[PDB]
């Protein structure tokens, strides 16, 4: 899967470093053709971002990140789309906040009883990203693949 | 034990998610008959909530949750019932605490609570000790 050194929002939560990526070693043409191609590692493209929500009681404009308070149980992040809310894995929520920051550093905390009223929707893939940090192998020690 | 997707009150302390609940794979009619049933995973209903307690020294009305600390170990939770108070485990109390309601339970002294009449009337058989470790069906296709 492809990745770019300019995108700081993805490199940091994933566990990569701009220098580390730039100093990567060459790949043979023979192995380049053998490995199948996977989806690209980029910031998720949430549609129609910034507009008002269709459903009532939405905690914020379309594309905002919502979370529920720790005192009620383990925290579940979610994204508010136009017609409902889609759940988010812990690792993607960090990427969305970092990229969609525009100065903001944290999500909106909302009570369970208000969440239960919002309809559930599914319109984003989010299957490409792992659920925990990458254990990048040190190529100097293992120079063969 | 049966479960529902809209009930955030019970899902959130248990660890499940509406997607993970609504997208589960099918079950055979044969396996459904071999398993015995269990009570539904719901917020346990309290009879005559808000009514007056029958025992003396009652910290509050029926349906209220009471808690007491200790010199060592975790805090002990309890619920007011028409005939007294029933002690509840930490995970169960979160179900009640999560469904609108009081900001925090009633804090009380250990000695008075020890003298208070203990009750065993509600059934907590279907509730676990920690968030469930749900088995990934792609790796385990057979049960």
Curated annotation (Swiss-Prot), chain A:
Family: Belongs to the EccB family.
Lineage: superkingdom: Bacteria
Location of this chain's protein in the cell: Cell inner membrane
Positions in coiled-coil regions: none
The protein's assembly and partners: Part of the ESX-5 / type VII secretion system (T7SS), which is composed of cytosolic and membrane components. The ESX-5 membrane complex is composed of EccB5, EccC5, EccD5 and EccE5.
Described purpose of this protein according to its UniProt entry: An ATPase (shown for residues 80-506). Part of the ESX-5 specialized secretion system, which is responsible for the secretion of EsxN and a number of PE_PGRS and PPE proteins, including PPE41.
Identification of the protein by name: ESX-5 secretion system ATPase EccB5
General remark: Part of the eccB5-eccC5 operon, which is essential for in vitro growth.
Residues of the full protein shown: 218 to 362 of 506
From Swiss-Prot, chain B:
One Gene Ontology term, aspect cellular component: peptidoglycan-based cell wall
Subcellular location: Cell inner membrane
GO molecular function per UniProt: ATP binding; hydrolase activity
Keywords for this protein: ATP-binding, Cell inner membrane, Cell membrane, Disulfide bond, Hydrolase, Membrane, Nucleotide-binding, Transmembrane, Transmembrane helix, Transport
Coiled coil: none
Span of the signal peptide: none
Main subcellular location of this protein, as a coarse class: membrane
Nucleotide-binding found in the keyword field: yes
Top-level lineage group: Bacteria
Recorded family membership: Belongs to the EccB family.
SUBUNIT field: Part of the ESX-5 / type VII secretion system (T7SS), which is composed of cytosolic and membrane components. The ESX-5 membrane complex is composed of EccB5, EccC5, EccD5 and EccE5.
Primary role: An ATPase (shown for residues 80-506). Part of the ESX-5 specialized secretion system, which is responsible for the secretion of EsxN and a number of PE_PGRS and PPE proteins, including PPE41.
Protein name according to UniProt: ESX-5 secretion system ATPase EccB5
Organism: Mycobacterium tuberculosis (strain ATCC 25618 / H37Rv)
